[PDB]
């Protein structure tokens, strides 16, 4: 580890405002009048994934030329 381990918050939110505009215009065919951030298509969800900046060392048995081309891609 080159860095202290930190945490990435990320969220998934479907835009309720844009969906309301599209539902009024009819581009979105949604009969339901109310969103739900707890669950469903409009679930605003929060999720935290751990983050490390480090040096990655792997030991194996393989041809040097073949691995180098794959990891160069």
């Amino acid at each position: 580890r080159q860095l202290p381990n930190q945490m990435w918050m990320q969220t998934g939110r479907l835009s309720i405002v844009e969906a309301a505009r599209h539902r009024q215009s009819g581009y979105l065919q949604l009969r339901a009048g109310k969103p739900n951030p707890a669950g469903g298509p409009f679930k605003t969800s929060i999720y935290h994934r751990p983050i490390v900046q480090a040096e990655l060392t792997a030991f194996c048995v393989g041809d040097q030329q073949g691995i180098e081309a794959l990891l160069s891609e």
């Binding site: 309720i16 405002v17 969906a19 309301a20 505009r21 539902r23 009024q24 949604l30 339901a32 009048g33 109310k34 969103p35 739900n36 951030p37 409009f42």
Partner: protein
């Protein structure tokens, strides 16, 4: 809709920055401790990456008015001048929570996490005023974005881009202004001057002995607060040309018409603060509506369809939308 208006403050700008700032008697900002320092309320400074030298881009101060302050100024201008006259000239009336929602965004703290209906959100963003300032208990996304008031300065050169290289200021942009707050009865000099005071000379002399005892207590503390308070405050110098970038994400015709009506009624409004010292007085000398100059001295004299749409929509303005905006699902 990318409204870029340019104003000229004819009186200093005092958007007071919160802090614990001091100043010497000479004018050095935040001196080292031990020297006699006076309280200073600095104006609102932002930091900005600017081009000093050649490619030596640095975070330099630029003293501004916050976009929250300018947003509330635009809101209260279109409220006191467009929304409320058209709402009193008919029989409509607001609840106290609806007034609170129309002015502060929300009717209270403690909002409901339950969202609002899709038809509700579409109708409220179709509203002339609610779609600009979407607050409420269920937090709408208001379609009006209000920028900070930036002085047209070299330190904002990366922000302004092009078209402002003339009438651009440089160098120092602010000024410390001092205030005395003199005790009133020290100015008392005669029996004719003291006849309005209960007791006359007795109460005045009693306050004088109280002042002497307080000064002795303060001298004992150095080695209850009086009416002598000498202090300073940093303002932005007047005569500056400022820019202000209103924007509207896919507006209704009436909403940008309401913004134009508030900009036309920006006359005799104060920008941030210092009401007693007249601070914040300004003259708009430009409005550009997607880049076309639509400000004469008489008024806007352009963008007519926005004005007819907002006239037809404040004709149809009522309190029902304001009341159902302010209504909490929890309450």
């Amino acid at each position: 809709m990318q409204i870029e208006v340019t104003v000229r403050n004819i009186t200093p700008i005092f958007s007071a920055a919160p802090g614990s700032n001091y100043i010497t008697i000479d004018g050095t900002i935040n001196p080292p401790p031990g020297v006699s320092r006076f309280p200073l309320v600095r104006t609102r400074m932002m930091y900005v990456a600017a081009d000093v030298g050649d490619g030596v881009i640095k975070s330099v101060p630029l003293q501004i008015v916050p976009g929250n302050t300018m947003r509330s100024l635009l809101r209260r201008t279109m409220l006191k001048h467009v929304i409320e006259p058209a709402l009193v000239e008919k029989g409509n009336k607001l609840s106290i929570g609806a007034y609170a929602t129309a002015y502060s965004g929300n009717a209270t703290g403690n909002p409901d996490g339950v969202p609002s209906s899709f038809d509700e959100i579409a109708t409220m963003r179709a509203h002339p005023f609610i779609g600009l300032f979407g607050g409420g208990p269920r937090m709408l996304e208001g379609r009006l974005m209000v920028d900070s008031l930036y002085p047209i300065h070299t330190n904002a050169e990366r922000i302004l881009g092009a078209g402002y290289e003339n009438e651009m200021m440089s160098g120092p942009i602010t000024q410390v202004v001092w205030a005395r707050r003199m005790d009133p009865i020290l100015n008392l000099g005669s029996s004719e001057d003291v006849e309005v005071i209960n007791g006359g000379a007795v109460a005045a002399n009693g306050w004088i002995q109280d002042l002497l005892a307080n000064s002795k207590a303060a001298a004992s503390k150095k080695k209850g607060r009086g009416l002598k308070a000498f202090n300073a405050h940093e303002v932005v110098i007047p005569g500056l040309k400022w820019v202000w970038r209103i924007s509207l994400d896919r507006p209704t015709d009436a909403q940008v018409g309401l913004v134009l009506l508030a900009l036309n009624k920006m006359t005799n409004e104060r920008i941030a603060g210092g009401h007693s010292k007249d601070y914040g007085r300004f003259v708009i000398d430009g409005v550009s509506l997607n880049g076309e100059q639509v400000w004469s001295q008489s008024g806007i004299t352009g963008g007519e369809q926005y004005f007819d749409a907002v006239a037809e929509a404040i004709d149809g303005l009522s309190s029902k939308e304001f009341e159902q905006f302010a209504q909490s699902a929890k309450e």
